[PDB]
Amino acid sequence: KIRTLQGRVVSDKMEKSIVVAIERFVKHPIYGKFIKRTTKLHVHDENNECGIGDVVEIRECRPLSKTKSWTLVRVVEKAV
Amino acid sequence: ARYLGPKLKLSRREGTDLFLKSGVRAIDTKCKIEQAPGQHGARKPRLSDYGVQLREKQKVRRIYGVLERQFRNYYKEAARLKGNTGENLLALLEGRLDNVVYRMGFGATRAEARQLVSHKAIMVNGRVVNIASYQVSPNDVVSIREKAKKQSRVKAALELAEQREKPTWLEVDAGKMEGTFKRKPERSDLSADINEHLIVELYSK
Amino acid sequence: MVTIRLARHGAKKRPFYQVVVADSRNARNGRFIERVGFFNPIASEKEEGTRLDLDRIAHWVGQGATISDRVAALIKEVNK
Amino acid sequence: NIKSAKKRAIQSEKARKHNASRRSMMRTFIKKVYAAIEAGDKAAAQKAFNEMQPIVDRQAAKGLIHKNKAARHKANLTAQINKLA
RNA sequence: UGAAGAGUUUGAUCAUGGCUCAGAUUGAACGCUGGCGGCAGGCCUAACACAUGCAAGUCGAACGGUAACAGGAAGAAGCUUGCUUCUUUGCUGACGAGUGGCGGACGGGUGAGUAAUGUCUGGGAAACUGCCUGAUGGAGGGGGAUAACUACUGGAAACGGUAGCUAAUACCGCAUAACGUCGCAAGACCAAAGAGGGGGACCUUCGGGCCUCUUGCCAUCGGAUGUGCCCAGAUGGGAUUAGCUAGUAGGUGGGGUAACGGCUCACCUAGGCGACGAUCCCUAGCUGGUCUGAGAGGAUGACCAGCCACACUGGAACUGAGACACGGUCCAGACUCCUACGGGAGGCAGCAGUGGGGAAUAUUGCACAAUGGGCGCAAGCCUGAUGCAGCCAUGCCGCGUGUAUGAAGAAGGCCUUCGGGUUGUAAAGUACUUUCAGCGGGGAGGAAGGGAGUAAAGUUAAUACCUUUGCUCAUUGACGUUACCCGCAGAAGAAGCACCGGCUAACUCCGUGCCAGCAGCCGCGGUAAUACGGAGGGUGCAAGCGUUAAUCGGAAUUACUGGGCGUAAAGCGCACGCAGGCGGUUUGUUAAGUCAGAUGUGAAAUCCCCGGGCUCAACCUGGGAACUGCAUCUGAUACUGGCAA
Structure with a gap:
């Protein structure tokens, strides 16, 4: 595993940078249940290959520009 | 202190007999028990729950000679043996x-x-x-x-x-x-000191 | 470089050393890698004052470990 | 500053005096190459690199310039001339 | 294996609910009182300023040297008669200063600043890494210097500067060039230091060359290690902080950094971030953990451990493997000090002390013994780390201040119906014992190593050296007048504090009379006060007790575990609805959630279970468990989520 997160695009306003939004089920031990905690991240992209609202696979990796350390491996689909 | 104070006088203030400083010749012959420790020791009060627990605690406490601080140490050693810690407690005393x-x-x-x-x-x-x-x-x-x-x-x-x-x-x-x-003290080797119920109430606070 | 050494943690007027692997660039009772047993000079055969780990050390020495006068000679007190 | 080892400052200074010179040399020679790059003088680029190739390297082995730093210098330099001349 | 409740609103009652108390605890402080010993802990405030002393150097087996010391010799004296004294001299121990290396980035302290690209936790990759250690190879031949030094010279010192002279494991060429670096390949390029011990055969104009050993030196790739770097999550509060953000966010291409990166730069795009809480403000070192607690949780982060930051204040770089360097350097600034007033010096948030501040926190202690650290080839030195002592009930714990017996129940009080009752077996009296303390005398263990020899079936010169090994011998103890044990009289030297109206265990008598005053709460007190003051008696704790502050509990009293909201506090005045939360049912699939197993990982200590060591316990300690976690791996498919039908 390359630390693979199935995320969903939310920003093609740059070329080679696409903000992908992903979540993990975060639990509170004091509210005693999981919830959706969604965290936008800054991925480094080949150019663009997707629209917005594009379900994708991304991976961790080297840094290679400011706040980068994830890559696009592939665009799963535009719509489910 | 270590107590070692006016011994028997506590037997007086509880009305219950003990050999502690008594003979086997004086059993409240030429000595007295419970006539009135103090000038108010004649008349008996009913006592609140806390009343019973305090008095009774002191019963057990003085036929080993044991202090407060000491007794707590015993209580966390009792509840640090797997057993009935009523028994464990009086076993350790x-x-x-x-x-x-x-x-x-x-x-x-x-x-x-x-x-x-x-x-x-x-x-x-x-x-x-x-x-x-x-x-x-x-x-x-x-x-x-x-x-x-x-x-x-x-x-x-x-x-x-x-x-x-x-x-x-x-x-x-x-x-x-x-x-x-050669074996431990047990519930059967109590000789009617079965007051384990009291002090375990007192102590749990 | 690791440095195997003694470390007294025992109460006053009663040494209880502890043969430990640390590094010499940190505190005697402070930062450690992992232990390799104990040394108690107060044992006189009513309890065992040592724990060997002969095996572990034998690997560590090749890994670039250094032995102090005491520790080195203490393998010697029990020989093999 | 009554301490014995405060004499190290004098040592540091003989050092700084020397280490300065080594940096300066290199710092200048490397610029003579970038001259040939920006002005586009293809021949020169080569020749100027060749004269400073040993120099920058020596200092490194010693530790003045150190190993790892001169590495990247030598990479960047040559890189220039390859896409140029 | 483990969770207590009571009082307090009402004339009385049950709810609702705030308040109080009982408890444990704390780096606690204070008042009163005081016997020890053991263990632990002991400036939290002004991150306020510091008199004085000390804590950072050490190697001559890298040097040029000989200043001292101690010795050798030479002339000479004294003629202490062949010996002492004197000058000379590196000759040998040995070593001042000076060069030179390596440490001085360790250890030690502190929490001011820092809510975060700082920490924590778990991952991760484009990194570097001296001393250590593995593997392969190398280490060739030279040169020009510069401190010291010498002779001057500038200044009051502080502190320098010239001129000539010189050393190196110093510096720099030149020679040499892989599993090396750059490069697509082709090609190019880069390093050094040797020192000691010992010696037979040769050689020295006799310091050495030679050989041998040995450690070190240079390189490259490893290992181990330390240290940077990135990501995600967890990290305090406040939305009476809602908008914020230009190197701002990203893309190109330069440069820089050990390496990735607006780190920095040129150009280009106009985004990026934010209520799933940015940004801003207050507050705070952060964590393991600690305390409390039945747990869950909360509060908290002292000592002990890890991390980060900080080092007079501010700031900066240099060196180096590593620093943005506590006792380095330089600059500025406010301090403080010196001064011959021209000009300079220093930095206790190191240990110990000082003044101050505060409610409060110890000796200008001892020591190289042990353990550890630094350097070194070893001896050895250096060590306010540390180990100990001193001072302090600051706390936890252990033991003692007596035992037995003892009544015409003694005087002496106190209360009393005046018969006594109470103090009280308490004391005296009798027989008994001397712990602990005190004095006198014995006395373990923490000490092995090293050092002076010999043994090697090492390495080589065939038994050198060096290393190796046991053996042989003489020692190594700061604590310390020791742990401990022996003897010595004689109960001798060793109990107090608070409270007793109710909560709450524990009552009477006087004095006073809503006055005096008490007071955690409810409330007492205006003349028989079970509540004040004193006394008598008693109750609980005890060398400590109480009081206060403070945390948590109790309090399900803000409720995840664990609440209500019709009228008691408490449903927006009512709809719609985005985001968010939730999702009827059937089949199939996935396996993200989830469950299981697997694997890492969850530091140690703290904690916990069993079990040892200190006369016991406190404490210390062994193994194991816990380490509530996290990620990954492999499995599971009922539910949950995702997709399809």
């Missing part, structure tokens, strides 16, 4: 070295036995022991000293013990005054 020695007939009294433990009179194995808070080990060798049976106190301290039940969990000896702590 009859684990005090001063008590087992008395209960093997080497002390005149519970209290006088601990006067012995002061001096180098008591020992376990070849090892000298002066500390009374020592919980003796299963199958012990709790002997009197050579140069302590020569004293007129130790001869006279087998005397007053005579003719008592001597609840058996241990051996009572007169060749070498050397016993064995």
Whole structure:
């Protein structure tokens, strides 16, 4: 595993940078249940290959520009 | 302190008999119990729950000679043996070295036995022991000293013990005054000191 | 470089050393890698005052470990 | 500053005096190459690199310039001339 | 294996609910009182300023040297007669200063600043890494210098500067060039230091060359290690902080950094971030953990451990493997000090002390013994780390201040119906014991190593050296007048504090009379006060007790575990609805959630279970468990989520 997160695009306003939004089920031990905690991240992209609202696979990796350390491996689909 | 205060007077303030500083000649003959400790000791109050727990605690507490601080240490050792910690608690109070020695007939009294433990009179194995808070080990060798049976106190301290039940969990000896702590004290070896209910209430606060 | 050494943590007027692997660039009772047993000079054969780990050390020495006068000679007190 | 080892400052200074010179040399020679790059003088680029190739390297083995730093210098340099001349 | 409740609203009652208390605890402080010993802990406030002393150097087996010391010799004296004294001299120990290396980035302290690209936790990759250690190879031949030094010279010192002279494991060429670096390949390029011990055969104009050993030196790749770097999550509060953000966010291409990166730069795009809480403000070192607690949780982060930051204040770089360097350097600034007033010096948030501040926190201690650290080839030195002592009930714990017996129940009080009752077996009296303390005398263990020899079936010169090994011998103890044990009289030297109206265990008598005053709460007190003051008696704790502050509990009293909201506090005045939360049912699939197992990982200590060591316990300690977690791996498919039908 390359630390693979199935995320969903939310920003093609740059070329080679696409903000992908992903979540993990975060639990509170004091509210005693999981919830959706969604965290936008800054991925480094080949150019663009997707629209917005594009379900994708991304991976961790080297840094290679400011706040980068994830890559696009592939665009799963535009719509489910 | 160590108490060692006006002994019997507490037997008075609880109305319950104990050998602590009494003879076997005075059993409240030429001494008095409960007539009125203080000028208000004649009349009896009903007592709140906390009333019972305090009085009763002090009953058990004074036929070992044991302090507050001491007793707590016992309570976290009781609840640190897997068992019934009512039993464990009163087992450890009859684990005090001063008590087992008395209960093997080497002390005149519970209290006088601990006067012995002061001096180098008591020992376990070849090892000298002066500390009374020592919980003796299963199958012990709790002997009197050579140069302590020569004293007129130790001869006279087998005397007053005579003719008592001597609840058996241990051996009572007169060749070498050397016993064995050969099993633990138990619920059956209580002799109507079954007041484990009280103090475990008191303590849990 | 690791440095195997003693470390007394025992109460006053009663040494209880502890043969430990640390590094010499940090505190005697401070920062450690992992232990390799104990040394108690107060044992006289009523309890065992040592724990060997002969095996572990034998690997560590090749890994670039250094032995102090005491530690080195203490393998010697028990020989093999 | 009553301490014995405060004499190290004098040592540091003999050092700084020397270490300065080594940096300066290199710092200048490397610029003579970038001259040939920006002005586009293809021949020169080569020649100027060749004269400073040993120099920058020596200092490194010693530790003045150190190993790892001169590495990247030598990479960047040559890189220039390859896409140029 | 483990969770207590009571009082307090009402004339009386049950709810609702705030308040109080009982408890444990704290780096606690204070008042009163005081016997020890053991263990632990002991400037939290002004991150305020510091008199004085000390804590950072050490190697001659890298040097040029000989200043001292101690010795050798030479002339000479004294003629202490062949010996002492004197000058000379590196000759040998040995070593001042000076060069030179390596440490001085360790350890030690502190929490001011820092809510975060700082920490923590778990991952991760484009990194570097001296001393250590593995593997392969190398280390060739030279040169020009510069401190010291010498002779001057500038200044009051502080502190320098010239001129000539010189050393190196110093500096720099030149020679040499892989598993090396750059490069697509082709090609190019880069390093050094040797020192000691010992010696037979040769050689020395006799310091050495030679050989041998040995450690070190240079390189490259490893290992181990330390240290940077990135990501995600967890991290305090406040939305009476909602908008914020230009190197701002990203893309190109330069440069820089050990390496990735607006780190920095040129150009280009106009985004990026934010209520799933940015940004801003207050507050705070952060964590393991600690305390409390039945747990869950909360509060908290002292000592002990890890991390980060900080080092007079501010700031900066240099060196180096590593620093943004506590006792380095330089600059500025406010301090403080010196001064011959021209000009300079220093930095206790190191240990110990000082003043101050505060409610409060110890000796200008001892020591190289042990353990550890630094350097070194070893001896050895350096060590306010540390180990100990001193001072302190600051706390936890252990033991003692007596035992037995003892009544015409003694005087002496106190209360009393005046018969006594109470103090009280309490004391005296009798027989008994001397712990602890005190004095006198014995006395373990923490000490092995090293050092002077010999043994090697090492390496080589065939038994050198060096290393190796046991053996042989003489010692190594600061604590310390020791742990401990022996003897010595004689109960001798060793109990108090608070409270007793109710909560709450524990009552009477006088004095006073809503006055005096008490007071945690409810409330007492205006003349027989079970509540004040004193006394008598008693109750609980005890060398400590109480009081206060403070945390948590109790309090399910803000409720995840664990609440209500019709009228008691408490449903927006009512709709719609985005986001968010939730999702009827059937089949199939996935396996993200989830469950299981697997694997890492969850530091140690703290904690916990069993079990040892200190006369016992406190404490210390062994193994194991816990380590509530996290990720990954492999499995599971009922539910949950995703997709399809």
